[PDB]
Amino acid sequence: AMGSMERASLIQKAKLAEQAERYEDMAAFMKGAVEKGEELSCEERNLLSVAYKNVVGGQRAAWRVLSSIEQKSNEKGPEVREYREKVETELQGVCDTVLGLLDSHLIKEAGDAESRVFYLKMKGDYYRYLAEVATGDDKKRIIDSARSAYQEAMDISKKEMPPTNPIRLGLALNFSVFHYEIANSPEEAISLAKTTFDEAMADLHTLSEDSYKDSTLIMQLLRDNLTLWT
Amino acid sequence: AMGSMERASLIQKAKLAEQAERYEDMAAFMKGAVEKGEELSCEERNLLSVAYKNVVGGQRAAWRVLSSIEQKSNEKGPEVREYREKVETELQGVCDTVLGLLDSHLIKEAGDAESRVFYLKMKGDYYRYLAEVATGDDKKRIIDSARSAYQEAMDISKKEMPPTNPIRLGLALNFSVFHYEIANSPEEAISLAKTTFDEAMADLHTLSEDSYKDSTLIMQLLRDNLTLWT
Amino acid sequence: HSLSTSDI
Amino acid sequence: HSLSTSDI
């Protein structure tokens, strides 16, 4: 996970860490690979995403559990708040690490559209994770940073990707979630999700037998969220 | 770190950590609670055991994944060995921490035959985990420590506990695992398991519905091991 | 608790 | 595999 290890050996160990479900190790290995300065292939981008998705995902789940106990008891002892603050700080440290790597190494002025959208979506997600736990004027700045990342990714995806492209779909999905849960604009979220689903459905016949599963899975999530939100 | 926190608060936070599936945090809170120098209740003993059981459990599962990938060498690069060593060192550090706590605070001459057997079984289990990864003169030294701890727990259980006592059953269960997997004595392992099962089976009619649930649960594990070993 | 790409 | 107490 360090700078004395060849880049190719870090990729190998990231895959081993994934097999062993050691996602903290996995993220550390991929962080070390990114810091080598070279671009990530598509497979390597997903290793990076999976690694940190699991790490932050466990922290978010823990934060939600403790935050509900704190609000339920809000209607006592400081143990819940104290521990929720400790998890929160840990979550923020991971998000900062991710955003740092994106700004420092991965977000480039010109790559291929697939990769440019991938990293800008990632920027929006991890700013969104910060917004879930922020509170004041610091939250306003985070939200605006998420919106700009999502919006720039969106603009690229609509100009360079077809409506059934799984990365464009995944972006619109997470962006619709941003509208609903962060920006508190349920009308934008429903509209975006419905529009994204319909324009994919209208083109679904143009998909091969292999890539059909990747797009429809996201389309089902869009549909699931619409049920939740309406 | 934990020294500034009240004992009761540490117990509350360990329970919170368990709800959030934050078992590394849970182990640190319980370690702090133990280091207050006061005995642990039955409830608190199980919190401690559950916490470190999850921690070392994930490491053992990861060590096994990597070790088999490493053993499949001609039925090659050093990455698998290096990462397996990293995990191994980390597993050992957790076991040492548990053994350090048992020797320094928990294992005592005083107390009921329930706490005394609980902690001595725990000492055997975590020397066994260390034995799973050791090799040389250090290994024999480790196996002797596990054997000795299991035997002393065994002696207390057969003298001060009925055959259906769940703690006695779990100790015998783990001791039989020690024979089969560590000492390489399948005959002793099978004999101990069968003896434990049959002797508990004969006394099941003297139990209530709750005790009957606890005992049979462990007895089924003895049954599973037997059917596999023979 | 809305669904995102993490939930595919 | 061999079941221990960890296996409920």
Numbering used by the authors:
A (entry chain B), B (entry chain A): -3 to 71, 77 to 231
C (entry chain Q), D (entry chain C): 443 to 450
Q: Which passages does the manuscript contain on this structure?
A:
The p53 pathway has therefore served as the focus of multiple drug‐discovery efforts. p53 is negatively regulated by hDMX and hDM2; prior studies have identified 14‐3‐3 proteins as hDMX and hDM2 client proteins. 14‐3‐3 proteins are adaptor proteins that modulate localization, degradation and interactions of their targets in response to phosphorylation. Thus, 14‐3‐3 proteins may indirectly modulate the interaction between hDMX or hDM2 and p53 and represent potential targets for modulation of the p53 pathway. In this manuscript, we report on the biophysical and structural characterization of peptide/protein interactions that are representative of the interaction between 14‐3‐3 and hDMX or hDM2.
The data establish that proximal phosphosites spaced ~20–25 residues apart in both hDMX and hDM2 co‐operate to facilitate high‐affinity 14‐3‐3 binding and provide structural insight that can be utilized in future stabilizer/inhibitor discovery efforts.
